[PDB]
Design a protein around this ligand. Structure first.
Ligand code: CUA
Length: 158
């Protein structure tokens, strides 16, 4: 089973959503190796560029629209992610890490850990507070997420 990951590029950090499992994160994602991954991408501000050099994969993120990317990580390990288009002050620290696990069980562990988080992203005041301008954000998980947050974000521009 391929995993679907939603991505919202914010002013100088990446917000990730896992619609299926009901968890969200900041600057870090995990998923099984040799497994298909579908990234549904958008931006809540200016235009950014989602890039992962060691997988040779890239895609732009613009407000109001949804872009798509598909990929398979051939080997387990962490892969560095960067924002490849100048977008202001925190351009250089607008990075993320992707962890391709050795199996699904290991991926299901990362997820469980995410569910043990006290932070949630289940309302309007949570999302906009996160969206506010910050730089070099450290990893962060959210145990819950608003049911249709991706669409909600996009349609603010629609
Ligand atoms: Cu976003 Cu550089």
């Amino acid at each position: 089973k391929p995993i679907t990951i939603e991505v919202v590029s914010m002013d100088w950090k990446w917000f990730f959503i896992y619609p299926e499992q009901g968890i969200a994160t900041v600057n870090e994602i995990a998923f099984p190796a040799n497994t298909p991954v579908y990234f549904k991408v958008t931006s809540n501000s200016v235009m950014h560029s989602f890039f992962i050099p060691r997988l040779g994969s890239q895609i732009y993120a613009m407000a109001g629209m949804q872009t798509r990317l598909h990929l398979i990580a051939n080997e387990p390990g962490t892969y560095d992610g960067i924002c490849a288009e100048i977008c202001g002050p925190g351009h250089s620290g607008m990075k993320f890490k992707a962890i391709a696990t050795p199996d699904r069980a290991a991926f299901d562990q990362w997820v469980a850990k995410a569910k043990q988080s006290p932070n949630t992203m289940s309302d309007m005041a949570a999302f906009e507070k996160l969206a506010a301008p910050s730089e070099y954000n450290q990893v962060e998980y959210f145990s819950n997420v608003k049911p249709d947050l991706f669409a909600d974000v996009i349609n603010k521009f629609m």
